[PDB]
């Protein structure tokens, strides 16, 4: 009967990753046999995708070969964390979506206490397609997230753009901002211990609206590794390898158009 049935012994395996893309009020959800993909977009330039594969869930059954509904992400996250944001004391989740015109059902249980949520779903609007293929990627860098987490959290937000330079030559990998105070450059050498993979065949310099890229910090903090790619269009791809509380690996992705 139910189009989508998902269950978790630990609700944080869903809520934690969703928080990393929470920079808009609403989000589009896609449920296939692979798992759940939640998409958040803004200004038709930036898009964040959270991927929670079926293997994460203790139970994940889907009927039709694609179930898509839009929802209030803020309300969803409020409900998923209804028993607190800092609990061996877990909170089980059972997620049920009947179909079009029906609300998303959430059954959360902690210590015998049961919270039942029913969130109405809106008309899904067309999800942007950034058409980002690996066969068109010019430069690619994989970094240890820990050594970049706090340096990124500090980039001057008074600046309008974040300029990313990737090059086979010095400074190899540079993040630049241009705010009121002046110029600021953050450089990572290709020989660095933070640099796990360096594949820059061509010098590329792209600029992106920093307001669009700022929420990706949330993903960076949760990630253990981060992959940075630009293509022949200048489009940016940020992929975050996230290890949840069960040691399982899920992914968050950020696309952003050039400025």
């Amino acid at each position: 009967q139910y189009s989508l049935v998902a269950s978790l012994d630990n609700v944080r395996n869903l809520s934690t990753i969703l928080k990393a893309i929470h920079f808009r009020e609403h989000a589009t959800c896609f449920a296939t046999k692979n798992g759940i993909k939640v998409t958040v977009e803004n200004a038709k330039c930036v898009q964040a995708n959270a991927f929670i594969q079926a293997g994460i869930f203790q139970e994940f059954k889907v009927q039709e070969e694609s179930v898509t509904f839009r929802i209030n992400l803020t309300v969803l996250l409020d409900c998923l964390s209804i028993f607190g944001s800092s609990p061996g004391t877990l909170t089980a989740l059972r997620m049920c979506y009947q179909g079009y015109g029906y609300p998303l059902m959430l059954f959360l249980e902690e210590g015998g206490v049961v919270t039942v949520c029913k969130i109405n779903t809106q008309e899904p609007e067309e999800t942007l397609d950034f058409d980002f293929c690996s066969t068109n990627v010019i430069n690619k860098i994989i970094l240890q997230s820990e050594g970049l987490r706090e340096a990124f959290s500090e980039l001057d937000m008074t600046s309008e753009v974040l300029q990313i330079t990737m090059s086979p030559d010095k400074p190899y990998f540079r993040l630049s901002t241009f705010g009121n105070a002046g110029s600021s450059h953050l450089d990572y050498p290709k020989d660095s211990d933070l640099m796990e993979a360096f594949h820059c065949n061509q010098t590329q310099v792209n600029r992106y609206k920093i307001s669009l890229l700022k929420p990706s910090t949330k993903a960076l903090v949760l990630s253990c590794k981060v992959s940075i790619r630009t293509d022949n269009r200048g489009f940016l791809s940020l992929q975050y390898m996230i290890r949840n509380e069960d040691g399982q690996i899920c992914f968050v992705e950020y696309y952003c158009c050039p400025d």
């Binding site: 798992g35 995708n49 594969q53 994989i142 796990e196 590794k225 790619r229 992929q239």
Partner: peptide
Amino acid sequence: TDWVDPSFDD
């Protein structure tokens, strides 16, 4: 929409 295509050296 397509599932994730990881670019990590896995």
